[PDB]
Amino acid sequence: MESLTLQPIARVDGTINLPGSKSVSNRALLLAALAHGKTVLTNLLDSDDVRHMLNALTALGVSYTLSADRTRCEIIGNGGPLHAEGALELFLGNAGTAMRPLAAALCLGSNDIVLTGEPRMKERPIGHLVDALRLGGAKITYLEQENYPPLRLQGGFTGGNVDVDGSVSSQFLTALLMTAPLAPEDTVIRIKGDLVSKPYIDITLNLMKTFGVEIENQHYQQFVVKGGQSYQSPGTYLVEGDASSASYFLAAAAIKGGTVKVTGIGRNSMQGDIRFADVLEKMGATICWGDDYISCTRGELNAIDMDMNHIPDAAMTIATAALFAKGTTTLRNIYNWRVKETDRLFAMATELRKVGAEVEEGHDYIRITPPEKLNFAEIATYNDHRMAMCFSLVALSDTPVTILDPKCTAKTFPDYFEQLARISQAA
Ligand SMILES: O=C(O)C1=C[C@@H](O)[C@@H](O)[C@H](O)C1
Numbered sequence: 001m002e003s004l005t006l007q008p009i010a011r012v013d014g015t016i017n018l019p020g021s022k023s024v025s026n027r028a029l030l031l032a033a034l035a036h037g038k039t040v041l042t043n044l045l046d047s048d049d050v051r052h053m054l055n056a057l058t059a060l061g062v063s064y065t066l067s068a069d070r071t072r073c074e075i076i077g078n079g080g081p082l083h084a085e086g087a088l089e090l091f092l093g094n095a096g097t098a099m100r101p102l103a104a105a106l107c108l109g110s111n112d113i114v115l116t117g118e119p120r121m122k123e124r125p126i127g128h129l130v131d132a133l134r135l136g137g138a139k140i141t142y143l144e145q146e147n148y149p150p151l152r153l154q155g156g157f158t159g160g161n162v163d164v165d166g167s168v169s170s171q172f173l174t175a176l177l178m179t180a181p182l183a184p185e186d187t188v189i190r191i192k193g194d195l196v197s198k199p200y201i202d203i204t205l206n207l208m209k210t211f212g213v214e215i216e217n218q219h220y221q222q223f224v225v226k227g228g229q230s231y232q233s234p235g236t237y238l239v240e241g242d243a244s245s246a247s248y249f250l251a252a253a254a255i256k257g258g259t260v261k262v263t264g265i266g267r268n269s270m271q272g273d274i275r276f277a278d279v280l281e282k283m284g285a286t287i288c289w290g291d292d293y294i295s296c297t298r299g300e301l302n303a304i305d306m307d308m309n310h311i312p313d314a315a316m317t318i319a320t321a322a323l324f325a326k327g328t329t330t331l332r333n334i335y336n337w338r339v340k341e342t343d344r345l346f347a348m349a350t351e352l353r354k355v356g357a358e359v360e361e362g363h364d365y366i367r368i369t370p371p372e373k374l375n376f377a378e379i380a381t382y383n384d385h386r387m388a389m390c391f392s393l394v395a396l397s398d399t400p401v402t403i404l405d406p407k408c409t410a411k412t413f414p415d416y417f418e419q420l421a422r423i424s425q426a427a
Pocket residue numbers: 022023024096097169170171174197200312313340
């Protein structure tokens with residue numbers, strides 16, 4: 001299969017202009033499609049996950065145009081719920097930010113649509129969202145395994161009292177929040193127990209407000225939504241650079257800098273992953289904050305032991321950065337790593353051991369003891385963009401690393417290796 005071998009990188013230094021945020025991009029596209037008016041999105045991410053959303057919108061009849069680099073998108077809002085019949089199949093790759101929000105949104109009114117995706121997506125849970133949608137009136141059928149895509153959506157979500165489990169995925173609540181305002185009746189969304197990864201709910205509410213809708217958030221335990229609302233185009237909207245994508249570059253400087261500055265995100269960002277910078281600071285790196293940048297400068301690197309549920313995606317970057325830290329690092333409260341692009345606790349533990357680390361794969365945590373020196377390994381990537389990006393950091397040592405299926409980074413960051421190369425220096 002395809003592979004890329006990264007030569008040892010002596011030092012990193014430079015500036016990277018970040019690709020757009022995947023989380024913001026897919027929310028903005030769906031809201032723009034539902035909204036009245038023309039929305040112009042700039043700094044939109046061009047990656048597999050966004051392409052699947054764009055293709056779904058095209059299939060649903062939404063009109064839009066894209067600039068040459070696909071980062072500027074002019075969307076003609078539909079002025080209401082999207083519709084299709086005949087069990088139209090929408091193929092969503094392995095994009096959770098397309099699958100979960102569309103699973104909910106397409107329950108408005110009548111419809112006959114099928115949502116499916118890659119094999120792994122048929123193994124990523126969606127039952128708790130389906131349960132909630134059904135409580136609100138939706139008719140949903142599991143075409144294969146109960147609790148997983150593919151789903152046949154036949155509409156009917158009118159609102160009412162809806163309970164949802166948010167203990168493993170915040171995306172189920174996000175999907176309900178974006179959908180409820182357009183339902184004919186008011187909706188009260190009750191969180192069954194605890195809610196995981198709260199920052200993504202804040203991103204959803206932030207985007208909804210940009211598109212003209214606000215709801216009543218009762219300490220994240222219950223959300224009161226008024227029905228009969230309409231989303232409205234914000235005119236021109238700038239998509240923040242991706243803070244999760246930024247993690248690799250900031251960590252690279254913490255390990256081998258130099259100073260690396262990422263632009264497109266700053267202290268005012270709505271993304272929870274900007275807090276990844278705080279972790280590097282706790283490890284001994286220096287961080288500088290700007291309006292539209294975050295930079296990291298090499299200091300030292302000490303192991304840490306902390307809960308990472310607030311930044312599950314960027315947290316993976318700490319797992320490989322730990323190979324360069326002094327002491328044993330423990331990342332806790334990351335059970336949900338198991339239900340993402342791959343089971344990341346199993347994958348991270350397996351690949352880290354290949355370069356020499358002693359690793360304890362806990363059920364919901366990972367403990368990493370770095371080796372005195374890293375060794376060469378051919379890293380398996382599990383169709384997971386972040387496995388490829390996290391392990392690229394192994395090359396900030398005296399050993400090269402070979403990454404299998406490097407193009408898997410395209411899920412969120414097609415140009416990843418060219419960007420890492422941009423800040424890689426020989427002297
Ligand atoms: O709502 C979102 O945008 C996301 C939430 C989390 O599940 C993340 O793990 C996922 O990558 C994106």
